[PDB]
Design an enzyme around this catalytic site. Sequence first.
Site, PDB file in Angstrom:
ATOM      1  N   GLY A  43       0.642  -1.291   0.025  1.00 23.65           N
ATOM      2  CA  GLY A  43       0.185   0.096  -0.022  1.00 23.65           C
ATOM      3  C   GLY A  43       0.838   1.325   0.163  1.00 23.65           C
ATOM      4  CB  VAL A  44      -0.054   4.849  -0.373  1.00 27.19           C
ATOM      5  CG1 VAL A  44       0.840   6.240  -0.577  1.00 27.19           C
ATOM      6  CG2 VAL A  44      -0.875   4.525  -1.668  1.00 27.19           C
ATOM      7  CB  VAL A  45       5.187   4.132   2.146  1.00 23.56           C
ATOM      8  CG1 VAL A  45       5.908   4.705   3.453  1.00 23.56           C
ATOM      9  CG2 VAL A  45       5.007   2.484   2.050  1.00 23.56           C
ATOM     10  CE  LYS A  66       7.159   0.975   4.654  1.00 27.62           C
ATOM     11  NZ  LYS A  66       7.965   0.199   4.176  1.00 27.62           N
ATOM     12  CG  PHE A  93      11.973   8.513   7.345  1.00 26.47           C
ATOM     13  CD1 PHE A  93      11.348   8.434   6.362  1.00 26.47           C
ATOM     14  CD2 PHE A  93      13.298   9.145   7.283  1.00 26.47           C
ATOM     15  CE1 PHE A  93      11.607   9.137   5.195  1.00 26.47           C
ATOM     16  CE2 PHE A  93      13.518   9.877   5.852  1.00 26.47           C
ATOM     17  CZ  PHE A  93      12.670   9.869   5.005  1.00 26.47           C
ATOM     18  CG  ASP A 145       9.355  -9.315  -1.872  1.00 34.26           C
ATOM     19  OD1 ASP A 145      10.050  -9.716  -3.086  1.00 34.26           O
ATOM     20  OD2 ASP A 145       8.550  -8.434  -1.762  1.00 34.26           O
ATOM     21  CE  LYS A 203      10.386  -5.466  -2.991  1.00 33.37           C
ATOM     22  NZ  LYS A 203       9.345  -5.908  -3.676  1.00 33.37           N
ATOM     23  CD  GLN A 227      13.208  -2.554  -5.541  1.00 34.41           C
ATOM     24  OE1 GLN A 227      14.175  -3.477  -5.698  1.00 34.41           O
ATOM     25  NE2 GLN A 227      12.251  -3.160  -6.123  1.00 34.41           N
TER      26      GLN A 227
END
EC number: 2.7.11.22
Length: 291
Positions: free
Chosen positions: A14-16, A31, A80, A125, A127, A129
Amino acid sequence: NFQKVEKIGEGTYGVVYKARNKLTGEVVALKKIRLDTETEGVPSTAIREISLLKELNHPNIVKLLDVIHTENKLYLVFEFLHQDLKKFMDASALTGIPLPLIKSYLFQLLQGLAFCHSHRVLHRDLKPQNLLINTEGAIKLADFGLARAFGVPVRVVTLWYRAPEILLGCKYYSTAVDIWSLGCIFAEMVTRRALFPGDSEIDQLFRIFRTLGTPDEVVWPGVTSMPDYKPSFPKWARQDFSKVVPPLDEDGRSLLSQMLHYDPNKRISAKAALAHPFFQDVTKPVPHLRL
Ligand SMILES: O=C(Nc1ncnc2[nH]cnc12)c1cccs1
């Protein structure tokens, strides 16, 4: 309770948003977790799983600050960090990331993995990013454990770092899956190009086979009985690592080879990897970061 500062991106779930906590002033990554029903509310097994992650704390794991389940919606509040490894690699493309810094990052990530794995928690998962970096030279694993709590959707979700057992339809994979992904990422740090950039499940599998050889019963007992194994897969021979990740030294190539063993039972563990002679001369350099 949170002031949105800016949109960071569309995450896996979802959007962060970068946001400020209005009652502490802390700056955080907020999140929002997409509900599939949206209407039915948050499935209870997800809330319980996620709540367990509040306790899985380590300096190389992005901290889960809070879990907010309100209005039948779910928000996760994370620590953050200002940069990610994907962005840092793009920035370092001309010159590459210095070996000592690759080595430090790999070692830190292996610490984070060994901690989590010792508690039987996987990422599933990894990666670039989701590998986040601070100005202090630290790298940390983001979204750890969220895949088990929420699932991993097809949407494109990158397959580049997926272990072969996952691609062959194994349902009951292990901590080895994260070691494979981190090996892929190690190779990409060194060469400045993704190792296996598939654009479908079969392209992903066949890129792996073209480099490491098509797996057989000799290197991977049981492989021919995996759910999605096909006897008609092309039979490619294995390549030299010296071709795959030049100019990495013998110790790095040895470690990489062990992290990319086909058989998940033979693949090196994060704990064992920390003992590898590659890390004999490891240091903690400070990255060159513009924010
Ligand atoms: O969530 C993301 N990036 C993040 N950026 C800064 N700190 C974070 N802590 C946890 N995730 C963080 C995403 C990046 C791209 C899409 S979402």
